[PDB]
Design a protein around this ligand. Structure first.
Ligand SMILES: Cc1cn([C@H]2C[C@H](O)[C@@H](COP(=O)(O)OP(=O)(O)OP(=O)(O)O)O2)c(=O)[nH]c1=O
Ligand SMILES: Cc1cn([C@H]2C[C@H](O)[C@@H](COP(=O)(O)OP(=O)(O)OP(=O)(O)O)O2)c(=O)[nH]c1=O
Ligand SMILES: Cc1cn([C@H]2C[C@H](O)[C@@H](COP(=O)(O)OP(=O)(O)OP(=O)(O)O)O2)c(=O)[nH]c1=O
Ligand SMILES: Cc1cn([C@H]2C[C@H](O)[C@@H](COP(=O)(O)OP(=O)(O)OP(=O)(O)O)O2)c(=O)[nH]c1=O
Ligand SMILES: [Zn+2]
Ligand SMILES: [Zn+2]
Ligand SMILES: [Zn+2]
Ligand SMILES: [Zn+2]
Lengths: 160, 160, 167, 174
């Protein structure tokens, strides 16, 4: 009945597109669905904490979460909802700009029925990209931005 | 450099969404992209024959083809473009409503670097679905339409 | 339920290994399994639950009827691949097929691709290109034989990418 | 050039078979290969097969550093049971950054469905990550987890289907 699926990848790999592909497959079969997005990324409920939308999620069969890395309560929420019989689909970055685990996201992997890591195209050499390189000098993890602030990159380009 | 990727599956499995996900990964990395759709499905560039858009395709790096099953020249076109260095990504039904090969699309498989078959949700029992059942009694292969005319189904529901 | 899974790819892509991985997953969970291999392929690397050589899948239908999971190696060489898989899946067996999608000419190998529309699961594995070492999707024949069926391994064939193929 | 590939899954999902499928693809194309196994897992079902012994280096270890010299001499390195190597991250990154293809089979989770050792730190480092499924040994649906049958509390308890079942979420929780 209930499950957690995780869609990992670097930026620009289409994780949110894959999330919506999966959600729509259920939606066309008449399942009730909810998608949650992280509220501070303004580049289908916005939220900063998943507990903020837990009431609405009780009333659906399928929950999609975009930018899962930003929710500090990702684990508790996904596990509770999957154990209550919901299908929970999470798109998230696996790694920060430092190729370190992004928040609590990887704690989901041992809890998950399905895990995939998508690839992007390296913006610097056009081979396949598994990582995200920050272009500026900000040292904090959370810096909202797109291709003006980040490049998807392969290993060689990450370290160039 | 050139290649053919094929995205197979029944109706309602999100083939065209996956096509666009893959194409957009190249587009954001500044490749020139062209997408082609079958002109008679009205429910990028429309076409009934790929030869008609061959010129525009010569001028891009990445060509996506939606509803590839409907193009009678799909094999010749994809092979020529890939052999000219283009990445050709094709979304198509693998089977008709009779679970027979749809057009010439399966002749791409031995030519292709990548082949995947997506699944839909069975609209009748909600297990995974690999096939498309026609709801009405029309016998002709090409009948354009959505969930009002077809259901994604599993094997058991396909056979009643 | 009743399913067909198809594992495609060129030579040297580990199709037979993937087939056995999938079968063993069921076997360890106490399912009765049978693996069928093409009897004319007597290569050592393509040896060795019930495990049975056949030239026609019908020839071991009696054994196949009494199991839950049937793996078939080198699907492309069985004249009855389509009919057998479909009948077995409709009888409730899980049928897992490893096969070449393409001949040395990159044309469909027998009737194998007619399984695709009947199948719940289809993947195409990759090999390593034996000529440039990028990923390979095709098999190139090394000698001048013109007939489709020539049994052999890396002695007679290479896995290749598109550029090396035409090379 | 170099890369890390990770094959996750519960027990009985065929992770070491997938590892060997991947490594053999390179071996048959004449790459020099080494496969490393965790020395303390002495089960018959986990031992190197004879054909692999004859075509690649196959080495037991309890620390990856202990086979670093051998690993430096090859192009492709496969690691079975990567969760048990405390230096998994350092080794895999060093080797991939020196041009090697590193392929790791590992459990993602312990019997408690918590991260197994340091293994998930590879995920952000890896070019490729898959999670395989097993068959639930209790209800026969797809299984993503491993349940311990006994009452042992320690994470590391070597054993097979006699001590562990692959299970789905429902069977995991009883
Ligand atoms: C790599 C990285 C990204 N970010 C930010 C940048 C973006 O605002 C955001 C990207 O999150 P994503 O999860 O990549 O957003 P998305 O769901 O749109 O992904 P996709 O394009 O694949 O569909 O996270 C950080 O704050 N810190 C980082 O270290
Ligand atoms: C099965 C079948 C479909 N069709 C038609 C119906 C549709 O108009 C068309 C299917 O287009 P698709 O793009 O395959 O349908 P879809 O939009 O549901 O696909 P997806 O979600 O996977 O992207 O093919 C036939 O004409 N004959 C048939 O045998
Ligand atoms: C390509 C090709 C192969 N063959 C033969 C050669 C082999 O005997 C047989 C292929 O069997 P496979 O099982 O495809 O060969 P393999 O063992 O290398 O594959 P894998 O690593 O994926 O398990 O087909 C032909 O007869 N004609 C052809 O055109
Ligand atoms: C789940 C779990 C396993 N182990 C042990 C048991 C085994 O000795 C080892 C796991 O071996 P694996 O190779 O993960 O198990 P397997 O041989 O069933 O795997 P596969 O079919 O995927 O190839 O780890 C623990 O110590 N703690 C745990 O919590
Ligand atoms: Zn690069
Ligand atoms: Zn159904
Ligand atoms: Zn090549
Ligand atoms: Zn179960």
């Amino acid at each position: 009945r209930g499950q957690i699926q995780v869609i990992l990848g670097p930026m620009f790999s289409g994780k949110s597109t894959e999330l919506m592909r999966r959600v729509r497959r259920f939606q066309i079969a008449q399942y009730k669905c909810l998608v949650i997005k992280y509220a501070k990324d303004t580049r289908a409920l916005p939220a900063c904490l998943l507990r903020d939308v837990a009431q609405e999620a009780l009333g659906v069969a399928v929950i999609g979460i975009d930018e899962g890395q930003f929710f500090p309560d990702i684990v508790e929420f996904c596990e509770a909802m999957a154990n209550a019989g919901k299908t929970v689909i999470v798109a998230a970055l696996d790694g920060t700009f430092q190729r370190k685990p992004f928040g609590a996201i990887l704690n989901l992997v041992p809890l998950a029925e399905s895990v995939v890591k998508l690839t992007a195209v390296c913006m610097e050499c056009f081979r396949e990209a598994a990582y995200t390189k920050r272009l500026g000098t900000e040292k904090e993890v959370e810096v909202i931005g797109g291709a003006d602030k980040y490049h998807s990159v392969c290993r060689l380009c990450y370290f160039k």
